[PDB]
Amino acid sequence: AHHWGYGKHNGPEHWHKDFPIAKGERQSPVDIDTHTAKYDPSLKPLSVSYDQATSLRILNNGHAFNVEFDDSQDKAVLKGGPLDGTYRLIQFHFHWGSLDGQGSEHTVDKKKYAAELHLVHWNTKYGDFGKAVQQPDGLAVLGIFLKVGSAKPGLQKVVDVLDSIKTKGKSADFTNFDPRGLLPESLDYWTYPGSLTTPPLLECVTWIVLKEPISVSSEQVLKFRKLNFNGEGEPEELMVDNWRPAQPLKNRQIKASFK
Ligand SMILES: NS(=O)(=O)c1ccc(NS(=O)(=O)c2ccc(Br)cc2)cc1
Numbered sequence: 001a002h003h004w005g006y007g008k009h010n011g012p013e014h015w016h017k018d019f020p021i022a023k024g025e026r027q028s029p030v031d032i033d034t035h036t037a038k039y040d041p042s043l044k045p046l047s048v049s050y051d052q053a054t055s056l057r058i059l060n061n062g063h064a065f066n067v068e069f070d071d072s073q074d075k076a077v078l079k080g081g082p083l084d085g086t087y088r089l090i091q092f093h094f095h096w097g098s099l100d101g102q103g104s105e106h107t108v109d110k111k112k113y114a115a116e117l118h119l120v121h122w123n124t125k126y127g128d129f130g131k132a133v134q135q136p137d138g139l140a141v142l143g144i145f146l147k148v149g150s151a152k153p154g155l156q157k158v159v160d161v162l163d164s165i166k167t168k169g170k171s172a173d174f175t176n177f178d179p180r181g182l183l184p185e186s187l188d189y190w191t192y193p194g195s196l197t198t199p200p201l202l203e204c205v206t207w208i209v210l211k212e213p214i215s216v217s218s219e220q221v222l223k224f225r226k227l228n229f230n231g232e233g234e235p236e237e238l239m240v241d242n243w244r245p246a247q248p249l250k251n252r253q254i255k256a257s258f259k
């Protein structure tokens, strides 16, 4: 929260001046070295229960767009995997590039994907999101890579509403959206302890990154790139390259759910 962003003058290399935890011990994203991630047979299958999810609204917040969910009841929850307890879906958003060769935050053996989807969940034992982010096990973020190829039919409703939220601070009703249509076939994953990838960079996230990317079309991601970072009536700055690069792994282990 302030004047941070993704420009030359306010981008990721500057964030540490207002948010010193930027240089902390469990920062995200990271590069996932697939040959050093260890298979952990003690990890449980992931439980994604989105049947009763209630989307409400879509918001251009000046950094990305968020699809927000009603999190006032146990609808839409993530459980299992590396997690203890129940985590409730609050929002999802994406990070993406100016070109198809960059845009993801996590990388896989240094490969950058065109974009990355983050489904954000908070641990119900802390009562609400604001309290959860103050805890080392407060959030679980499910990360899904996007590659450019075939269209993702379940993404199109999101793509088509973006015209109505071009600029920072615009929102639109966005009810009855089913986030199951954004998942890949397999729920095989890597997991590690990390942080929010934007300020305030709080070290409160269990990351769960799916191995299988989803495919989206070139036309779908091109529409992401028509969004604006700026507000209405301000100089147009295309919302592109809203990703933080990989951060040092430090004293962490990345675990794989699969052999
Ligand atoms: N990219 S990411 O790691 O999935 C991510 C997720 C949620 C946030 N939420 S937030 O920092 O914008 C935020 C923090 C506290 C409160 Br209260 C509300 C929003 C930031 C980054």
Ligand SMILES: [Zn+2]
Binding pocket: 093, 094, 095, 118, 197
């Ligand atoms: Zn994110």
